[PDB]
Amino acid sequence: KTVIKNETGTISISQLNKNVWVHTELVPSNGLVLNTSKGLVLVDSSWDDKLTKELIEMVEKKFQKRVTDVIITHAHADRIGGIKTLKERGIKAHSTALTAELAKKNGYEEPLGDLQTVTNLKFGNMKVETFYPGKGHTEDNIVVWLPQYNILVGGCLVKSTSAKDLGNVADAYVNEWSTSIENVLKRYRNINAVVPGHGEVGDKGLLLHTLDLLK
Ligand SMILES: [Co+2]
Numbered sequence: 001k002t003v004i005k006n007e008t009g010t011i012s013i014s015q016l017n018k019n020v021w022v023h024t025e026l027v028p029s030n031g032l033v034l035n036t037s038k039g040l041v042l043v044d045s046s047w048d049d050k051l052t053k054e055l056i057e058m059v060e061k062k063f064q065k066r067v068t069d070v071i072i073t074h075a076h077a078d079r080i081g082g083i084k085t086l087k088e089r090g091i092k093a094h095s096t097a098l099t100a101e102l103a104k105k106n107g108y109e110e111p112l113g114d115l116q117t118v119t120n121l122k123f124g125n126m127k128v129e130t131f132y133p134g135k136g137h138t139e140d141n142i143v144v145w146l147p148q149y150n151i152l153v154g155g156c157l158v159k160s161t162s163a164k165d166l167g168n169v170a171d172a173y174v175n176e177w178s179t180s181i182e183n184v185l186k187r188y189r190n191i192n193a194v195v196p197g198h199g200e201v202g203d204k205g206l207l208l209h210t211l212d213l214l215k
């Protein structure tokens, strides 16, 4: 897997296949870059507007196409923090209605609130399903599924192997989180890669790890 850095190390992209890359920025955080025939689509942007601009510029230059859309997986600063940049550049910022209203309540500009419990999007050739499994890391957390690759973007709902505890639970629902993870396992019975919110890429084992952290 080919791995390309910004100058400073603060942003890194790692290839999963011909058209899917994982983006990581610095505490580490992950999203996806989807290289589609109609433009670049991100699953999550970054901690703040500075890193989000850097991410966008790196990918636009490398892939020679514009970022057209971003899927925001919950309303916390690490996910929603580059919203201002997205809005001012005319990048469509997709979210559930709940994610949008939490973003507003917390002083952020609002994403679209277009995503339902299950939403199916097509960006050129690239199919993307978004799924709200229930409450867990936050009230609003969603997952993203790429049916052409069986790749799940878990976000902070899903903990990496390295994670030895649940992290920030101030906004979490620790008695629902297990049912939510089960909902994902029931929906996606054959998973090739699982991208956690933070940490290394794994497989279904990361969902099982999260279940154990919840005991
Ligand atoms: Co969060």
Ligand SMILES: [Co+2]
Pocket: 078, 155, 156, 197, 198
């Ligand atoms: Co997080």
